[PDB]
Amino acid sequence: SVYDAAAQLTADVKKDLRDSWKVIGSDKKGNGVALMTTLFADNQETIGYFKRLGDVSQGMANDKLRGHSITLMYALQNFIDQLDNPDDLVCVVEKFAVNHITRKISAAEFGKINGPIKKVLASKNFGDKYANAWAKLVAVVQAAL
Amino acid sequence: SVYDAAAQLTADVKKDLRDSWKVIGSDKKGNGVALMTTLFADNQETIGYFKRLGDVSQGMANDKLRGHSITLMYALQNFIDQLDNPDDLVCVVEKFAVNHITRKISAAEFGKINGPIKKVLASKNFGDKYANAWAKLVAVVQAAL
Numbered sequence: 001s002v003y004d005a006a007a008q009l010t011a012d013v014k015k016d017l018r019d020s021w022k023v024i025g026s027d028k029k030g031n032g033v034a035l036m037t038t039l040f041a042d043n044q045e046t047i048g049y050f051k052r053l054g055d056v057s058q059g060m061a062n063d064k065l066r067g068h069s070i071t072l073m074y075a076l077q078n079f080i081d082q083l084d085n086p087d088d089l090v091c092v093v094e095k096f097a098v099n100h101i102t103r104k105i106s107a108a109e110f111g112k113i114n115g116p117i118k119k120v121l122a123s124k125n126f127g128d129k130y131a132n133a134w135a136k137l138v139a140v141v142q143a144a145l
Numbered sequence: 146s147v148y149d150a151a152a153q154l155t156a157d158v159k160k161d162l163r164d165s166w167k168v169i170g171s172d173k174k175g176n177g178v179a180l181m182t183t184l185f186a187d188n189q190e191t192i193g194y195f196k197r198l199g200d201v202s203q204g205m206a207n208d209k210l211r212g213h214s215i216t217l218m219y220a221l222q223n224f225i226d227q228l229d230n231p232d233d234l235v236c237v238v239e240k241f242a243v244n245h246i247t248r249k250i251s252a253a254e255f256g257k258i259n260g261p262i263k264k265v266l267a268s269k270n271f272g273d274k275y276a277n278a279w280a281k282l283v284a285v286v287q288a289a290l
């Protein structure tokens with residue numbers, strides 16, 4: 001239940017999401033591409049889904065990948081801005097869920113993003129505490145897949 | 146090319162885009178829904194394209210329409226943030242262009258958004274100069290369609 005999942009976002013979780021986002025969200029192009037490349041590097045079996053982006057091993061040099069990455073960061077920006085209103089958070093989450101449901105992405109495979117997120121956060125000096133906070137936001141999306 | 150259209154946006158145009166977005170963009174849910182509803186009111190022929198959103202006459206009450214509207218405003222947020230780097234603006238514009246190319250939206254049909262934009266701008270007292278500034282940003286997307 002996406003609604004029960006959203007209720008898991010307590011005051012402490014929301015604060016950690018915001019604090020960490022202020023830092024990582026300041027460089028959407030850099031951190032966005034880092035997130036994606038890390039995903040492809042640690043989970044090669046997911047690369048097939050991104051056929052449209054071309055050669056993802058080119059990283060920042062790949063225009064399609066860069067465009068994709070930046071846009072992805074704005075989806076997270078959307079989520080963060082909706083934290084005060086669970087009804088609005090839910091409707092945007094379900095909107096992006098659809099984009100993945102059509103791509104045949106399951107809740108389990110969507111969860112493979114948690115590894116990359118922890119690594120990107122770690123490189124910015126944010127530990128498990130912040131990684132666990134984001135796992136909870138990711139869980140809201142998973143509940144809608 | 147799309148780059149040509151992007152690279153043309155002058156300092157004065159970027160200024161009007163940013164000043165108007167500061168206001169309109171501060172209420173993404175309210176202004177995004179008004180933009181969509183205005184499009185359906187003045188161009189009823191486009192209603193058919195949004196069948197996934199259900200009953201669009203429901204306005205704010207329609208969760209799917211609300212989620213779509215908020216998300217559309219973040220695509221604009223994305224554009225606004227990439228203004229000083231044509232290379233990044235282009236790759237994100239092309240990304241969203243694919244989203245519409247897939248729905249068989251022509252450059253002409255996409256330009257229908259200009260009327261609604263003008264009205265939303267006017268409701269906040271932003272005149273023709275600002276509407277023309279936005280028509281120029283829309284043209285960047287049209288160059289990709």
Ligand code: HEM
Nearest residue numbers: 046049050052071072075076099103105109110112113244
């Ligand atoms: C932090 C979590 C994630 C967010 C916020 C996110 C966001 C997005 C966004 C905004 C798009 C563009 C939607 C569209 O225009 O159709 C997208 C596309 C896509 N996503 Fe995700 N995504 C996430 C995780 C994942 C994961 C883990 C997978 C794969 C295991 C995945 C697979 C896809 C695929 C296949 C596409 C289509 C790419 C294309 O053809 O352009 N996403 N995602």
Ligand code: HEM
Nearest residue numbers: 099191194195197216217220221244248250254255257258
């Ligand atoms: C300022 C201009 C506009 C922007 C920034 C914009 C942005 C967006 C975004 C972000 C999506 C979601 C893409 C996806 O997840 O697949 C979308 C979908 C769509 N757009 Fe636009 N759009 C604009 C104007 C228009 C206009 C004028 C039309 C056609 C008359 C149009 C028709 C569509 C359709 C049919 C969809 C699919 C909706 C669905 O089934 O979910 N768009 N647009």
